[PDB]
């Protein structure tokens, strides 16, 4: 498996165009749990490890230890795409409640929802 909001999975984003974040990288499930149950697709936010700290209100930092990733990475809430579940590979971890509150406010800003 059951896919829960705030889980981090390995996903294949290829291919992409221009400045879109591509490749096979970690992504966090941001779609609601009901969508995550019945829908053939999920909505994710890309996670990138090519940066460590980021002073942007749509970026959220995640520790490598607590969240069990390759290195300290950053969730990019401006890089979002709906992926068919077939693109999700292995499950890495899931985000804590506090971190997911941060992801929520970051989404509110990213989409100008207030």
């Amino acid at each position, epitope marked *: *498996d*059951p*896919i*829960r909001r*705030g*889980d981090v999975y390995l996903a294949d984003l290829s291919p992409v165009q221009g400045s879109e974040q591509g490749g096979v990288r970690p992504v966090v499930i941001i779609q609601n*749990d*009901t969508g995550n*149950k019945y829908s053939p697709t999920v909505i994710v936010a890309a996670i990138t490890g090519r940066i460590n700290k980021a002073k942007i209100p749509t970026h959220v930092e995640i520790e490598k230890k607590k969240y069990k990733l390759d290195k300290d990475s950053v969730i990019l809430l401006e890089q979002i795409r709906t992926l068919d579940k077939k693109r999700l590979k292995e*499950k890495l971890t*899931y985000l*804590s*409640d506090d971190k*997911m509150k941060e992801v929520d406010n970051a989404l509110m800003i990213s989409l100008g929802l207030n």
Partner: nanobody
Amino acid sequence: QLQESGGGLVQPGGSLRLSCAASGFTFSSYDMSWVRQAPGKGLEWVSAINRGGGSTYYADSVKGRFTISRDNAKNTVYLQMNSLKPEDTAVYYCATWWVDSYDYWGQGTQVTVS
């Protein structure tokens, strides 16, 4: 797959800690509930707790008397029952809540208050 323990007989005003141990599935992906059934009565939902532990819910009949908790490292759910009263006598099942329905059910455990 779900084994309950901790039930027993106690006098009124006593306390107990029911526990439910999960195996054979990924515990970090389901929400958990406690529901009870008294002899000759239907199932009464008692409490629930989300996947990460931050959010907990309780039936009006047990509210404030019982406290639900989870340990995701031990893959276990707990229910701390305090200020027990005779009407709490029942068999207590843990169950997994996934968006809307229940899926796996544990082996009941008896709680008696007299």
